[PDB]
Design a protein around this motif. Structure first.
Motif, PDB file in Angstrom:
ATOM      1  N   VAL B  57       8.549   4.052   1.374  1.00 39.41           N
ATOM      2  CA  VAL B  57       9.833   3.880   0.721  1.00 39.41           C
ATOM      3  C   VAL B  57       9.979   2.401   0.378  1.00 39.41           C
ATOM      4  O   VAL B  57       9.928   1.546   1.264  1.00 39.41           O
ATOM      5  N   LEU B  58      10.125   2.105  -0.911  1.00 38.39           N
ATOM      6  CA  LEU B  58      10.493   0.763  -1.337  1.00 38.39           C
ATOM      7  C   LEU B  58      12.010   0.656  -1.358  1.00 38.39           C
ATOM      8  O   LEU B  58      12.695   1.414  -2.051  1.00 38.39           O
ATOM      9  N   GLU B  59      12.525  -0.298  -0.595  1.00 39.85           N
ATOM     10  CA  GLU B  59      13.950  -0.535  -0.510  1.00 39.85           C
ATOM     11  C   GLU B  59      14.280  -1.905  -1.115  1.00 39.85           C
ATOM     12  O   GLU B  59      13.758  -2.931  -0.673  1.00 39.85           O
ATOM     13  N   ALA B  60      15.127  -1.913  -2.139  1.00 40.16           N
ATOM     14  CA  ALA B  60      15.511  -3.154  -2.811  1.00 40.16           C
ATOM     15  C   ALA B  60      17.022  -3.358  -2.748  1.00 40.16           C
ATOM     16  O   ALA B  60      17.785  -2.579  -3.326  1.00 40.16           O
ATOM     17  N   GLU B  61      17.446  -4.387  -2.020  1.00 38.03           N
ATOM     18  CA  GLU B  61      18.848  -4.794  -1.997  1.00 38.03           C
ATOM     19  C   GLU B  61      19.069  -5.842  -3.078  1.00 38.03           C
ATOM     20  O   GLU B  61      18.320  -6.822  -3.161  1.00 38.03           O
ATOM     21  N   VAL B 113       7.335   6.241  -2.786  1.00 35.91           N
ATOM     22  CA  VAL B 113       5.996   6.039  -3.325  1.00 35.91           C
ATOM     23  C   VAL B 113       5.001   6.838  -2.489  1.00 35.91           C
ATOM     24  O   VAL B 113       4.841   6.588  -1.289  1.00 35.91           O
ATOM     25  N   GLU B 114       4.353   7.805  -3.131  1.00 34.49           N
ATOM     26  CA  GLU B 114       3.330   8.624  -2.489  1.00 34.49           C
ATOM     27  C   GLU B 114       1.980   7.929  -2.595  1.00 34.49           C
ATOM     28  O   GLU B 114       1.638   7.383  -3.645  1.00 34.49           O
ATOM     29  N   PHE B 150       2.416  -3.514  -0.985  1.00 37.38           N
ATOM     30  CA  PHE B 150       2.738  -2.541   0.050  1.00 37.38           C
ATOM     31  C   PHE B 150       1.915  -2.820   1.297  1.00 37.38           C
ATOM     32  O   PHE B 150       0.714  -2.547   1.327  1.00 37.38           O
ATOM     33  N   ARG B 151       2.565  -3.382   2.314  1.00 34.86           N
ATOM     34  CA  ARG B 151       1.917  -3.609   3.604  1.00 34.86           C
ATOM     35  C   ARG B 151       2.931  -3.747   4.728  1.00 34.86           C
ATOM     36  O   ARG B 151       4.061  -4.209   4.522  1.00 34.86           O
TER      37      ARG B 151
END
Ligand SMILES: CC(C)S[C@@H]1O[C@H](CO)[C@H](O)[C@H](O)[C@H]1O
Ligand SMILES: [Mg+2]
Ligand code: NA
Ligand code: NA
Lengths: 211, 210
Positions: B57-61, B113-114, B150-151
């Motif tokens: 899961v990409l989380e953008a605030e 994101v899969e 992604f890490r």
């Protein structure tokens, strides 16, 4: 468990004792074949429980041991907990199954080297210095056996002691062992000589390994 | 006309006692930036994972400054090359934070994101995140962006793990130093250093000490 006078003498002269249950199944394949079997739990339990009932009042006994070289079986975990429940005053140790199982309060390997790893499958003998800091490991390490003094031996003994003194959690070990198990035989003139395995017609035998 | 008076020594110098040449001046870039009145004022990107890193899961605030309006939206889109992989759009107004409500001037976007391509020093897979501030009807106000790797970095059972694996840091400390230009850095020198580092089996650098 030793002759009862042994503990009296250790109480009075001042020696720390590891009192050890009469359980060794070294020759089984695999080593834990009996100790993992619930049908052998009754027989094993009595070798542990009756030792504790006999010796629990001796101050020289500071550590209980579940026996020797019997792999690691569910029976060990059961008897470990039994002792912990009955006598909180003494840590319990046991080497079988890799020297750091759930049945031991003390990492207690036999013949683990100071600096050299021996990465055997399932039951590795790590360098003792390395063993202490394995991820998640917190226990003290005291070798139940080290420096096998067979014949012209004890080479590298100082390497252990340098390590014991440098590392707080390396708290020593028990040399293997005190006294040669040679037996007296006599020649035709009645003169005594020291005999080892095989000298009594015993076969199969393991020759001088008793010394 | 700009006038800049630069002092060599300050109370700041007491916290700048690094083992290096002591110099002074305007030694990094100077620039002018034009932003709209209604603007992206901040944004944070987080990537969290399932146990085997097969899902992320990409989380953008995103934070805004300017006048709050019902028609305002943020779209965060994630790109792998010229392929858009995920997109989220929301109006402003964060979840309730405490007894006085939440951040009306903030929004959090969550994109699935899969099988993310994972970033490491071995394979530096990167996605591009585009943060669009726009009206409900689709008029762009402004876009900001960043490279996304992604890490997961965590310490577990006494081990530093990257993407679940224990790192072995082949590191070097690196000061910003040029024999002719002092403490002014250029792209060419930076690229030279990185190529030499990797060519000599380094995978890590410490920004000693700033
Ligand atoms: C020979 C090894 C495979 S077993 C080894 O034998 C020794 C011989 O004195 C000791 O009895 C040790 O306790 C035992 O681990
Ligand atoms: Mg310094
Ligand atoms: Na020590
Ligand atoms: Na022996």
């Amino acid at each position: 468990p030793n002759h009862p006078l042994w503990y009296t003498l250790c109480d009075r002269y001042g020696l720390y004792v590891v009192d050890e249950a009469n359980i060794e199944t070294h020759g089984m394949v695999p080593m834990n074949r009996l100790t993992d079997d619930p049908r052998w739990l009754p027989a094993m339990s009595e070798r542990v429980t009756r030792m504790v009932q006999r010796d629990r009042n001796h101050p020289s006994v500071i550590i209980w041991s579940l026996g020797d070289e019997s792999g690691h079986g569910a029976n060990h975990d059961a008897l470990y907990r039994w002792i912990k429940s009955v006598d909180p005053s003494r840590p319990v140790q046991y080497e079988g199954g890799g020297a750091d199982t759930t049945a031991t309060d003390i990492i207690c390997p036999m013949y683990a080297r100071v600096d050299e790893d021996q990465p055997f499958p399932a039951v590795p003998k790590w360098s003792i210095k390395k063993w202490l800091s394995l991820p998640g490991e917190t226990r003290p390490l005291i070798l139940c056996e080290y420096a096998h003094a067979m014949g012209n031996s004890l080479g590298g003994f100082a390497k252990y002691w340098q390590a014991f003194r440098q590392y707080p959690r390396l708290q020593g070990g028990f040399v293997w062992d005190w006294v040669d198990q040679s037996l007296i035989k006599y020649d035709e003139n009645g003169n005594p000589w020291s005999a080892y395995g095989g000298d009594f017609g015993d076969t199969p035998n393991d020759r001088q390994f008793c010394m | 006309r700009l006038a800049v008076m630069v002092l060599r020594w300050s109370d700041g110098s007491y916290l700048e006692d690094q083992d290096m040449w002591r110099m002074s001046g305007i030694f990094r870039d100077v620039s002018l930036l034009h932003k709209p009145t209604t603007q992206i004022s901040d944004f944070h990107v987080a990537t969290r994972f399932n146990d085997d890193f097969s899902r992320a899961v990409l989380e953008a605030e995103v934070q805004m400054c300017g006048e709050l309006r019902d028609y305002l939206r943020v779209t965060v889109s994630l790109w792998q090359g010229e392929t858009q992989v995920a997109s989220g759009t929301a109006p402003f107004g964060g979840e309730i934070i405490d007894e006085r409500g939440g951040y009306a001037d903030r929004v959090t976007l969550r994109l699935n994101v899969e099988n993310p391509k994972l970033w490491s020093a071995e394979i530096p897979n990167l996605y591009r995140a585009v943060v669009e501030l726009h009206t409900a009807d689709g008029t762009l106000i402004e876009a900001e962006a960043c490279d996304v790797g992604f890490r997961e970095v965590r310490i577990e059972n006494g081990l530093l793990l990257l993407n679940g694996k224990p790192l072995l840091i082949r590191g070097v400390n690196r000061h910003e130093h040029h024999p002719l230009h002092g403490q002014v850095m250029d792209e060419q020198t930076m690229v030279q250093d990185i190529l030499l580092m990797k060519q000599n089996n380094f995978n890590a650098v410490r920004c000693s000490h700033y």
